[PDB]
Design a protein around this ligand. Structure first.
Ligand SMILES: *[C@H](C/C=C/C(=O)/C=N/CC(=O)O)CCCCCCCCCCN=[N+]=[N-]
Lengths: 257, 246
């Protein structure tokens, strides 16, 4: 039944709204210009100094630590979301941990796109906007930790997904039977089969004119995986050049591989 | 309607058979049973003997390079049979082939692999997985991740009919760097993906979301390709021939 699939789509959307305070719908309203929602714009060193004044070491470092503490929050929301995915919680505990471990970054970059356009990114729950050019300005190695994310975001935002589509997509990502060290792959794949079935129907109903959006979206997973590996290599460099610099344990457990 | 998709699937099948001499159906027959068993290479002495029937890790690696170059031409001919491919900007054609060939070489190599080895020399031979892994560094950890991909990929149980459209979808990727006119490429790929989807529903009616799982395998291909290129760069630190194989 299509109906069982629609109900699973409605359940995941609902749960996505409960888990993630800044939706794509909100992020777009802020970026697009729908008076009360307008962000303060950080494009240079003086703007940054003024940002603390209303928005919520050394500059590139302070910014980078800012993202790290923001990724940790995101891991906490994504983890909350995951428990809502039917069956995830019944999986062997080790696997739950493995799925989260490899799923969490791909999801972060998927949702980060929602906060992005060609020339910048939303910050402090949408109160701020930091320009892409200011971020690329940052002293090396931090100059280009964000560039690949912008590049993916511009391409990904071209699909015009809305939140109800993404809720199912990030579910399909978490429930990948193809992660290293999975003890029981089979229970994971039956859940994903179901999620994929629900995505498929949801894209066809919600995006009727968008030929092969399902396929086109699944190919994006390749771009996500590429982004993750590049970030890891960049982190390796930071820990060597900035030995003073501290990484959050939660993030540091995710990177152990 | 679907009749234009079925036409497309048969066309591509017919072209894939003409372009690739050793098909998956034929490679399977040999790996499992049914009529000359291949000369098996499992040891240094089997290799030596096998050259007569058909500076070690290096000889084997240059053979992989010779065969990959043969496969490039087979794939180029196939590509030209894909509707719309020859009508694309010539530079776009070279770019699609340039970046698409490694992914397809590994896709098709999976047809020639099982978990314990790979067929060589048009199926006249069989080089065992253990003897490849056995080879000194960095040649040992070289073929090992393709076996890993091939085991997972073969579990989808695709046949030649299916892979012919899949290969076509790979070649028509609009995200290759430096493309000049992405539109007609995406337009062809959209049409190929519709053809692949219908193929998999008719040909594998009980295999839920096979289309989706197959597309998910594109991630693994690109990961492998990127890993391969990183091993090549390390080999580069170990006459006319350099030129031919580049
Ligand atoms: C930051 C998004 C980061 C993505 C990412 O993957 C980062 N990884 C870092 C890592 O792995 O270590 C872009 C938005 C800019 C953030 C600026 C927010 C300011 C908050 C300050 C809070 N201060 N503290 N602590």
């Amino acid at each position: 039944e299509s109906a069982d699939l629609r109900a699973l789509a409605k359940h995941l959307y609902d749960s996505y709204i409960k888990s993630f305070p800044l939706t794509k719908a909100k992020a777009r309203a802020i970026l697009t210009g729908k008076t009360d929602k307008s962000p303060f714009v950080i494009y240079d060193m003086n703007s940054l100094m003024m940002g603390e004044d209303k928005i919520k070491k050394e500059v590139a470092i302070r910014i980078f630590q800012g993202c790290q503490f923001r990724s940790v929050e995101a891991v906490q929301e994504i983890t909350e979301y995951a428990k809502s995915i039917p069956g995830f919680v019944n999986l062997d505990l080790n696997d739950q941990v493995t799925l989260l471990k490899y799923g969490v970054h791909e999801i972060i970059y998927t949702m980060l796109a929602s906060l992005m356009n060609k020339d910048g990114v939303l910050i402090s729950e949408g109160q701020g906007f930091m320009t892409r050019e200011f971020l690329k300005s940052l002293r090396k190695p931090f100059g280009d930790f964000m560039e690949p994310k912008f590049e993916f975001a511009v391409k990904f935002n071209a699909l015009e997904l809305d939140d109800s589509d993404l809720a199912i997509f990030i579910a399909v990502i978490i429930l990948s039977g193809d992660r290293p060290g999975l003890l029981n792959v089979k229970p994971i794949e039956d859940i994903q089969d179901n999620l994929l079935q629900a995505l498929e129907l949801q894209l066809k109903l919600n995006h009727p004119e968008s030929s092969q959006l399902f396929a086109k979206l699944l190919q994006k997973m390749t771009d996500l995986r590429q982004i993750v590996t590049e970030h890891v290599q960049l982190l390796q460099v930071i820990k060597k050049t900035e030995t003073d610099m501290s990484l959050h344990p939660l993030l540091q457990e995710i990177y152990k591989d």
